[PDB]
Design a binder for these strands. Structure first.
Length: 105
RNA sequence: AGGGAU
């Protein structure tokens, strides 16, 4: 008995976010952050987040990440929305993989 | 369910 797996949802740069009201969604996250593309939305709190409502984002290289880093603890409608950088120009990978790199890549 | 903030 054996198996195999891959990765396609962590291979990139990222940032964290909160303050997102328990009554709003990603359709306004990637629309208040910056004029950037929607390549950058997710929503989570936990299997115990009462109803969930916080978020996290990802970016195409550190260049797009800093191009969105301009609202540390800004606003959106009625709460002080916040987001905190979690990327650098050299951390696209460093602790995981997505292929056996021995016979399939 | 609220701020945790840097």
């Amino acid at each position: 008995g054996d198996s195999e797996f891959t990765v396609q949802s962590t291979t990139g740069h990222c940032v964290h976010m909160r303050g997102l009201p328990y009554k709003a969604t990603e359709n306004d996250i990637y629309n208040f952050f910056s004029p950037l593309n929607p390549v950058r939305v997710h929503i989570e709190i936990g299997p115990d987040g009462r109803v969930t409502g916080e978020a996290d984002v990802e970016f195409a290289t550190h260049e797009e990440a800093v191009a969105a880093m301009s609202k540390d603890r800004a606003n959106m409608q009625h709460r002080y929305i916040e987001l905190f950088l979690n990327s650098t120009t050299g951390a696209s990978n460093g602790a995981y993989s997505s292929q056996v790199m021995q016979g399939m890549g």
